[PDB]
Structure 1
């Protein structure tokens, strides 16, 4: 019920500075931060950076329930203040993707939920651009999650916008289709299916480096997505 929101922020920052400690107190602070994010708040103009960078640090906490909750909070900041992530997109994406290799299923689940919102909230062009080097160079299963994110983002852009991004997008998918991991090859097929649904036959000249066998498999999934 307070007007002065900065005071609330200061006490939240203070509590959350207690990395690897005070788990219950920090859960309260995190939930408090979640609540604020819903509120119609003047916090963000002054404190967005400070909150975000402390929350991203908190992703590395030793306590699983803290990492998981920090990702839930991040998810809400993403869907309510997407414009503010302009200069922190690379960082925020990487941290969200990295959480996908957590040994704790609850943390991976929270990261998948965050990744989903990130893809529907962040500027689509910028997201695709950020994801391209990650898809080409990150370790399994971070590259996998990046491809899945790229797919979600591609479904949000116009044909004209996608055509402009395709030279950045295509190399990772061509290379991913040869990846040793079945899940990475499948994600790339799924991503190519989603491109096809936007640009149709225009996709074909981008695929000149594929073998016949890889073309067959892509055409099969193209045909499966068209039917049932």
Structure 2
């Protein structure tokens, strides 16, 4: 009874904004209660309605829907086995929102998604996204790829390199420093797994880009403020690498 009521309320279009936020928070509540029988009967219906709600014109509804999505990912990760590409694609797409709150909520959902999704399957969908998507969806995809690369074996990673590498080499040439930095950090993660077997894949990198990558590899080996500091430091170090 309750679930049908919540779904009907959330099916309302362009009206009843506060009542729909209550319905989303009731879904969040059921998720925090576990409500295992609700998911046994209604997982598909709830997930698909939630993903539609990502397209709502109200930013506070989009952000809240992403918070609910994150909770369902945390509590019911196994059921996403059959919705992997859909959930990755919708979550990445939300990163291009004009409203910072929606982007932040998409980032938080993406962080959780990266730890549950089958890693090889995730890497495979991210590769063409990284090569084709607009900024900052490409950025989000590279950051997700880094997290899933951290979850595969050397043997698996070596098999996936021919698909992974072109996007990282391309992204290292992007005009956005955030994308270049994300690519450097992804390459550091790849190197952490396969070591100097990365070498032949890097032949297209210029001297300055190799120097900068080497600097960050050495840092990883030797050891809000920290993040912002790191982002600016990357720009200064990159500047120095090109002189």
Per-residue Cα deviation, 1:179-228 (whole angstroms, up to 9, x for no partner): 2222111110110001111111111122122222221111111112222x
Displacement of 1:163: 2.0
TM-score, normalized by length of structure 1? Answer: 0.91
| Structure 1 position 57, deviation (Å) | 0.8
Q: Please, which moves more after superposition, 204-213 or 181-190? A: 204-213
Per-residue CA distance 1:29-82 (angstroms, 9 max, x = gap): 111111222334122233211111110111111111111100000001112222
Greater shift in the superposed pair: 94-103 or 69-78: 94-103
Q: Distance in 2 between matches of 1:36 and 1:223?
A: 47
For structure 2, the 5+ residue unaligned runs are 223-243
Q: Give the Cα separation in 1 of the matches to 2:84 and 2:27.
A: 20
| Equivalent in 19, 22, 26 of residue 20 of structure 2 | 26
1:203 aligns with 2:198: yes
8 Å Cα contact 1:19-1:58 kept in structure 2: no
Question: Is this contact kept in 2: 1:78–1:122, CA < 8 A?
Answer: no
Q: How many correspondences in the alignment?
A: 221
**C-alpha deviation, 1:164, in angstroms:** 2.5
1:143-196 superposed Cα distances (whole Å, 9 cap, x missing partner): 011101111111122222222222221111111111222211111011000111
Structure 1 spans left out of the alignment, 5+ residues: 1-6
In terms of mean alpha carbon deviation, does 152-161 or 140-149 score higher? 152-161
Structure 2 counterpart of 1:4: none
**Contact 1:97–1:146 (8 Å) recurs in 2:** yes
TM-score by length of 2: 0.86
Q: CA deviation at 1:17?
A: 0.1
Contact 1:100 1:111 in 2 (8 A): yes
The equivalent residue for 1:36 is 30
Q: Secondary structure at the match of 2:83?
A: helix
RMSD over aligned Cα, in angstroms?
1.4
